[PDB]
């Protein structure tokens, strides 16, 4: 029957305009006092899923 | 004398190689902000239009071509960026 | 480790706070500093508070 969306991947990835996926950078949930502010500033903006993991996320998330 | 004896070793530790060394060699043409050499301590020094980061990484501050030269009284090695 | 974590709250009333580590035993005196406050975009006195 209908393929089922991997709900975790649906929560963590969003689809864009040409087919890429935007995700949130890791390393920003806790242990933040010891992380330099430059590092956190770079980790705030959303990033793009790389080519290698494109296949994984696409298979996980067919109704994206 | 049947099977074997035994005895542990105290070593078997090491660290991830850092990929230091000259990235762009002499004669190459770099864009501004290109890392020319990653190093531990100023083995190479910052010449013209070349900046030295905190980890003594030399990066070109201006577009152009790399140029190594021995310079100064201590015969040290300076990386300069000829304007191109 | 031996250093605890403290937050320097702004005295400009923004509620903004920096965070840092402090040696409680060797420097029992509180810590005050002039640190930039993005909310009011001015350098203001930041004083120590528990995390």
């Amino acid at each position: 029957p209908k393929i089922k969306t991997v709900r975790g991947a649906a929560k963590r990835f969003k689809k864009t305009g040409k087919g890429g996926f935007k995700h949130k950078h890791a390393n920003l949930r806790h242990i933040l006092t010891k992380k330099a502010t430059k590092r956190k500033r770079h980790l705030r903006p959303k990033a793009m899923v790389s080519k290698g993991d494109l296949g994984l996320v696409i298979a996980c998330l067919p109704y994206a | 004398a049947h099977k074997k004896a035994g005895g542990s070793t105290r070593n078997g530790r090491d660290s991830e190689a850092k990929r230091l060394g000259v990235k762009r060699f002499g004669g190459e043409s770099v864009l501004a902000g290109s890392i020319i050499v990653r190093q531990r301590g100023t083995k190479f020094h910052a010449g013209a239009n070349v900046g030295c980061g905190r980890d003594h990484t030399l990066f070109a501050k201006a577009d152009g071509k790399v140029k190594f030269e021995v310079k100064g009284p201590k015969n040290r090695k300076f990386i300069s960026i000829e304007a191109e | 480790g031996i250093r605890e974590k403290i937050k320097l709250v702004s005295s400009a009333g923004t509620g903004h706070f920096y965070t840092t580590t402090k040696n409680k035993r060797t420097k029992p005196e509180k810590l005050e500093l002039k640190k930039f406050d993005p909310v009011v975009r001015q350098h203001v006195i930041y004083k120590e508070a528990k995390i």
């Binding site: - | 035994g6 005895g7 542990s8 070793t9 070593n11 | -």
Partner: protein
């Protein structure tokens, strides 16, 4: 396996031409006999050489 071994004896790698033993103050023939006796205890072919200016 299980690590390296323990040091058991010390050697000195010998390459051809290395002048192992030297002797002075004795007659030449007695030096030859002494060097023959010594070389008989070594696992390397040897030869008898003399001093020269250069």
């Amino acid at each position: 396996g299980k690590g390296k071994g323990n040091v058991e004896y010390w050697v000195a790698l010998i390459q051809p031409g290395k002048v192992l033993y030297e002797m002075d103050g004795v007659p030449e023939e007695l030096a030859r006999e002494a060097f023959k006796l010594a070389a008989a205890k070594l696992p390397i072919k040897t030869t008898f050489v003399t001093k020269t200016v250069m």
